[PDB]
Design a protein around this ligand. Sequence first.
Ligand SMILES: *[C@@H]1O[C@H](CO)[C@@H](O)[C@H](O)[C@H]1NC(C)=O
Ligand SMILES: *[C@@H]1O[C@H](CO)[C@@H](O)[C@H](O)[C@H]1NC(C)=O
Lengths: 101, 50, 504, 132, 132, 75, 75, 107, 107
Amino acid sequence: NMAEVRSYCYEASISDMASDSRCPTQGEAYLDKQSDTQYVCKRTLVDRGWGNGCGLFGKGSLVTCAKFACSKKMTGKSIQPENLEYRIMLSVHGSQHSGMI
Amino acid sequence: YLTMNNKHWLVHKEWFHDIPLPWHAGADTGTPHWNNKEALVEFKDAHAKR
Amino acid sequence: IRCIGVSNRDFVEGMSGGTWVDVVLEHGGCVTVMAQDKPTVDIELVTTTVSNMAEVRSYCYEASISDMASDSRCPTQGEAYLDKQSDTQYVCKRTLVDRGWGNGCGLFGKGSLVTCAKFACSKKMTGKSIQPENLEYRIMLSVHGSQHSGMIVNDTGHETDENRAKVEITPNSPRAEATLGGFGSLGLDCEPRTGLDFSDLYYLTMNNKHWLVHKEWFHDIPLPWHAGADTGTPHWNNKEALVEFKDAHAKRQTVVVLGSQEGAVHTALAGALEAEMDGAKGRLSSGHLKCRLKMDKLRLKGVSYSLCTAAFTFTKIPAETLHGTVTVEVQYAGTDGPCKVPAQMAVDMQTLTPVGRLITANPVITESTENSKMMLELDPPFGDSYIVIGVGEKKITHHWHRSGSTIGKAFEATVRGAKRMAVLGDTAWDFGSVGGALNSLGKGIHQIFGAAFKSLFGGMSWFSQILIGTLLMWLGLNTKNGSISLMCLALGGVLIFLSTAVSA
Amino acid sequence: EVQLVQSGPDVEKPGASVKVSCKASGYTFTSNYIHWVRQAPGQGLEWMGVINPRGGSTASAQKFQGRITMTRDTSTSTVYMELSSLRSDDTAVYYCARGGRALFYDSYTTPRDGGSWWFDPWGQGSLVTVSS
Amino acid sequence: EVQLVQSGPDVEKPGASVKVSCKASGYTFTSNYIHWVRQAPGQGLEWMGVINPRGGSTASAQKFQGRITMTRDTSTSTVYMELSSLRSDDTAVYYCARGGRALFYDSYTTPRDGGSWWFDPWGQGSLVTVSS
Amino acid sequence: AVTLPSHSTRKLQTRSQTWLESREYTKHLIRVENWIFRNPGFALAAAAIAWLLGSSTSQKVIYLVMILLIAPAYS
Amino acid sequence: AVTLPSHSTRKLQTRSQTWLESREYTKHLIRVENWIFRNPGFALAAAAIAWLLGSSTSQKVIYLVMILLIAPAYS
Amino acid sequence: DIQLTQSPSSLSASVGDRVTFTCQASQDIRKYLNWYQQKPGKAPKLLIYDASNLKTGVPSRFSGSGSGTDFTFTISSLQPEDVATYYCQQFDDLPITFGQGTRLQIK
Amino acid sequence: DIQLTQSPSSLSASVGDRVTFTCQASQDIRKYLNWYQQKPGKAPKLLIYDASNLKTGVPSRFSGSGSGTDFTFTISSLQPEDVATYYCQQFDDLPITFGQGTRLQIK
Ligand SMILES: *[C@@H]1O[C@H](CO)[C@@H](O)[C@H](O)[C@H]1NC(C)=O
Ligand SMILES: *[C@@H]1O[C@H](CO)[C@@H](O)[C@H](O)[C@H]1NC(C)=O
């Protein structure tokens, strides 16, 4: 009769990723998936120019927000002294065989 | 009792709360809200390509 | 053009003394090369590839264990044994267990117990080898001129264009010359042998992810290795790391699968460089290259041209880069044919006295008689300026102002040279050109000092460096002689500085 | 050759959602913006929206805000358009064609255009009929 | 003359192991790698593996590691290939031919090739039929 | 099975970002931080040890740093 | 992701054998052994550092042990 | 949103005629206009990118021009395989607008 | 494991014809290819080592060429004793791959 405090997931399963690409000095990017909590995000800054489809030069502030998922977690079940047991054994010397020990 | 897959072992609790992986605070109904999410999936940027 | 706002571009002004400029290409940046004549060319490194591979050791992870045999002997009846030990797929340890009448047979005491488990593997690294032959560096040559908004887009005809060339150098045939029809033919003597000190680096494949690691790292990993024999029961040596034989307090001994160690090896790889595969080609995306550079056969293609008549109109808002130039994209209606672009950078309407150093030497339109589009790249002076075209009534004039002064660019070039010394030191001195008893002797002294530095300070992480640097900077204020304290303080400053320039 | 090929015609109920596929051939799939354009039979063309097959970002017109969703599949090189909250006005033919200047992520107008601006790869189109 | 001569055809049961011999004549036996190559009747050729008759080292393909073993006999100048875990797919004709620049061991890839890379010596081949 | 060759021993210093550099330049420090949060009494113990060595009042701090960085990692 | 809580910090001392005790009581020593095999020059460097501290000829060996066990582990 | 008016609604001409189409945007789209002909329910035939340029594979009887906001498409010689619905397309500011259409009929 | 495609599958020609065979590897095998003809169930006849070289004893009607990855075998004059199954063989990286085959038939 043990209860479950914090678990941990030691594997990951990524998908779907996401992306932004807001040209420099055109603000911060939306990506609706980052509003939802299944997705993970680290907004980074990217140097851009005439190649990457921008008029001005500098950093663009994208973040791919990819969908975290889990497989094979590990559980951290907790115990208190309740619902515990020992099963001790008593075996008085007395007179027994060799097969009865 | 730390349980990974069909094998179990005792764990001191300060060690247990000091692990940096996701948290899954209560239980397992459906897929949960995974906390802290940063020990796992790692994404970075080099040469300003993706 | 192929070096536009890449933020690691380095352009060298001047190649004086015999048209021979050496350059340190790398994948992380690009080099713009310009001179008094012989138009500005952008030289790069893009893809280090390696073709053929050789399989060094393989390391298992996810082990499957069965058949688990076990045999014990009465406490003086010899060592334990079972036929399964003659199979050499199986893992065996011999512990001492108790024994009594309540254990089975014996006198009393402690007798040997072996337990044996089948060992079979599912995930493994192939661990291929890199030799300093067998590789080809791809270098993209790009000439500033008749080209607009390029930098990638349509490369197959863009290679056929006179502005670009691909140069696949290799240590089989280094020192290659690429044709630029009308511009000339640019030669380059690269040294692909001394690039990254290969044959110390093994290519390493986990599942679909691929790293370049050190061989002195890769031998020392305590996982079960395979070798090279690609035959049946791959005989995994070790196989003792990945299992663990755990007994009771005295009695029965069980085996333990220690489980998939794939993420632990990922956390152990904190310091390798990524790579990719194309079929069999290990594509490396990192790395550098030293290269002498023959600018002997370059023509400007546009000396004997006229100057364009009118309809200059520039279209896309002159666009300052990182520190760089102003990159103005212009459009020529009404022109007749291959006429030159008059462009300059003047302070005001006083003799127009041009003070710019435009870097796009001799800019030339194709013909089009229509909307043809040019790129222009001009250094302006650090005060107020005007980008000016000089030809025509209401010619086209645009105002300009910079940010920062001359000493700011001096400190910025100082920290660029500082990063040039931090990465790839012992060939940073061969980024600049001709050196007789200055650059060669500085490179030699830096060679001795960096060789001694790498010999006595290897195994230096970032945090290690910071600790030892702070320890030696404290000792720099200590005891005596003003010299060993100065050597200690200089060496600690070098340590702290090479720690800061990597991560920052 | 360079070609976009779509799914067959679909018949859906009002209030449901339809999904139209758009598979690429003959070019690098992550190099051209896929634009979706509707056409009613008694009307001309109308631009629905745009996805980048790299990174899966979207944008669309004002007449479809919240009704359209565009997903990708880089493995099969396919573009999915899911139109939700269907009405009798949505009975149309849907097209998808590629926008040459796909460097990074979804916009790119003041840079270059044309040369199948979009024209050439849309293929057969997809009739979508919303009724009972 | 320079010739490799094999054993006769064999009929084996599935799950058993077959042994095919390959005896040399006309050349120094420890100077040429013996390559074993299978051929199904409804299929082309397929390289099984390689032994060096000097030192008896082996290598083979990915489709047969663990299933094939190659031994030598320097006295009788003979090469034995034992294929274990036979199935109905192994009903084929087995070949064994040289390939020079066979100085030390293993393979010898980047050094020279050709001139009976393994063309000449083959002889009559060995039909191996796995059934009941 | 303890995969002891941390490749930071032989890291490559090239102009790209490395495999885990962003998460590498904090990890040993926050490991020591979590260890001294979980074992605060060893700070007083290491102070009493390090005060007995050196007799210099500036070597004491050096022995403190030495012991308090031995105890999380090489322990 | 660096799973920094080594549970040897909080090991249990009960009469059974532990989870990895047999492979635990050698691992830090052979890690230091492999590190000083791969980086032999840091021994001479650490000798030149540690000779400058302490001035006691028995504290020198203590600083040697301190530095040469810092450098593999918390490095 | 850049309302793009296409004149006229539909036309008819005989084989070998010259015909012109006008597209006027409400705002400045300077050279960002494109031209389609679409046969009904079929894969179309290609006319004009960038308001003045032909594509490879297109026969040279089609041409386009226009500088500020008014754009003129021109068929030099009408042929019986040129019956289609003719569209023009803005490129600027991206609520990308098409014209209403221009149908032709063989006389 | 380099995949070695052999084109075509089978051919037929009359006596005295010129015929060409193509082998394309997925990776660069630069001059490491060779060519077999195998009469069915027999000791074969020798064509080409090193993708361009004849062996002594081979009649000179056979030839081979190829530089990067595409390799062309060429029979100048077909003869009735040249009916066989034609194979090409990689040399590099050693999962040594053969082609599928090329059969001929006498007309
Ligand atoms: C064990 O005890 C049972 C009685 O519960 C008896 O029937 C059996 O014979 C005993 N076995 C041995 C080996 O002593
Ligand atoms: C892109 O392609 C078009 C036609 O396909 C070509 O005219 C143009 O030159 C290409 N771009 C560059 C920068 O070469």
